[PDB]
Amino acid sequence: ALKRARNTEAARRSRARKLQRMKQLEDKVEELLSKNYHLENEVARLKKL
Amino acid sequence: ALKRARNTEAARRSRARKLQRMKQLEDKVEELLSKNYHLENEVARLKKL
DNA sequence: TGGAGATGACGTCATCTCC
DNA sequence: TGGAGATGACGTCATCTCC
């Protein structure tokens, strides 16, 4: 059927978006963990001086 | 068939783990964004004083 | 070992959303 | 509006992994 054919592609596009969103999110946690470390270290330094 | 029955449940358990992992990850980004803000603000303060 | 479970992509159905 | 697309869960098959 036709509605099925269209839905099969809509599902394909939807899955693809969910896979990129996950990766995007995983990268962000990596980015924030590093930014966090530099600030935490920075705080210790300024605290001393 | 039997192997199919088992796989149908293995898939159910697997999906469940992927849903919790996503949520866990989403919470972490929220947590780090806030911790980041407090440190960034903290740095500005110590910088001044 | 061979064999069990885990997991990625698939296509489908049910629903929601949005004009 | 009614109708189009988006999306969550499903069950299946193919493969990987791990003893």
Write the layout of secondary structure elements.
Two copies of one chain form a homodimer.
Chain A (H helix, E strand, L loop, with lengths): L1 H47 L1
Chain A binds a DNA duplex (19 and 19 nucleotides) through helix 1.
Structure explained in plain terms:
The structure is a homodimer of 49-residue chains. By secondary structure, chain A is mostly helical. The first copy, chain A, has a single domain, classed as 2-Layer Sandwich (Double Stranded RNA Binding Domain), CATH 3.30.160. Helices cover 96% and strands 0% of the residues of chain A. Chain A contains 1 helix and no strands. Chain A is rod-shaped and about 75 Å long. In chain A, 0% of the residues are buried. Chains A and B meet through helix 1 of A and helix 1 of B. Chains A, B: It comes from Saccharomyces cerevisiae (strain ATCC 204508 / S288c) (Baker's yeast). Chains A, B: This is General control transcription factor GCN4. Chains A, B: It is found in: Nucleus. Chains A, B: Belongs to the bZIP family. GCN4 subfamily.
